[PDB]
């Protein structure tokens, strides 16, 4: 996260760290949507251009985390995976269209002050909240800067990072890049004339873009950190998998398995 700040304790209790068993490595962000289902980006599990292919026995999820690096005794809970589900029409070849995956946990996690699921939007919630100018929130343990000379701070945070970012008009998202944009993604971030800055970066992918409903106080996952061109570049935006546009597939997987 570029231009963010340390999360408060319990501020993002649905945040999940997708973790490689051996070697022990942060793989991606993810989000808890029930006691046994976790949402992430497809490219975290399958990305052929970099020869990436992880299956259920390779990974685990760590829930309730704050520190990026410490094992957080009596706070975080870890779970093995039972099954991985990648969207059947995930397009890694070109524009990361439908960059979404689901993971079923081997055993349900018990909720706590630090562990709690986020809501998924329905049609009116998506129509109401996902509008240009409205701000959502992105969280992750990824890089704090694209390049080293961009600021004086460290490369990686010691603690989960948070930034709020406005949704961008679709024609502005489209004009910002030569990559072919689809209706299954949206982009967020500030324009140069807005002065403020911030973005998701390398290591934040798979994590949630969430918005708080002004009408029922609940937090809804609208997006998944997917891709971008650099991080926090003037005239560029971070791109997010559009969660509601893929909710029919999400519901199919969960109702069937």
């Amino acid at each position: 996260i570029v231009e963010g700040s340390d999360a408060e304790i319990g501020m993002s209790p649905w945040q999940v760290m997708l973790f490689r068993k051996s070697p022990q490595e942060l793989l991606c962000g993810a989000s808890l949507i029930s006691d046994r289902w976790v949402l992430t980006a497809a490219h975290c599990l399958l990305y052929p251009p970099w020869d990436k292919n992880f299956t259920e026995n390779d990974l685990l999820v760590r829930i309730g985390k704050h520190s990026r690096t410490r094992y957080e005794r009596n706070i975080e809970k870890i779970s093995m995976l039972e099954k991985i589900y990648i969207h059947p029409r995930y397009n890694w070849r070109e524009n990361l269209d439908r960059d979404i995956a689901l993971m079923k946990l081997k055993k349900p996690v018990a909720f706590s002050d630090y562990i709690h699921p986020v809501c998924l939007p329905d049609r009116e919630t998506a129509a109401s909240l996902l509008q240009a100018g409205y701000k959502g929130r992105v969280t992750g343990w990824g890089n704090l800067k694209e390049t080293w000379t961009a600021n004086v701070g460290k490369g990686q945070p010691s603690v989960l990072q948070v930034v709020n970012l406005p949704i961008v008009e679709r024609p502005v998202c489209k004009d910002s890049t030569r990559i072919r944009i689809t209706d299954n993604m949206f982009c967020a971030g500030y324009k140069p004339d807005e002065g403020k800055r911030g973005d998701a970066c390398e290591g934040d992918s798979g994590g949630p873009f969430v918005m708080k409903s002004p009408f029922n106080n609940r937090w809804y996952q609208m997006g998944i950190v997917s891709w971008g061109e650099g991080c926090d570049r003037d005239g560029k935006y971070g791109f997010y998998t559009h969660v509601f546009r893929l909710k029919k597939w999400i519901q199919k997987v969960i109702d069937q398995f």
Binding site: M11, I33, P117, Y134
Partner: peptide
């Protein structure tokens, strides 16, 4: 789950976090 999206240390305690007002403000001014 009918309890989703309500944080135990915030909404369930009627406490706001340090930056969520900027999200709610964007519904008014954004």
């Amino acid at each position: 789950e009918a309890d989703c999206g309500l944080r135990p240390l915030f909404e369930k305690k009627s406490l706001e976090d340090k930056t969520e007002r900027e999200l709610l403000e964007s519904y008014i001014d954004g």
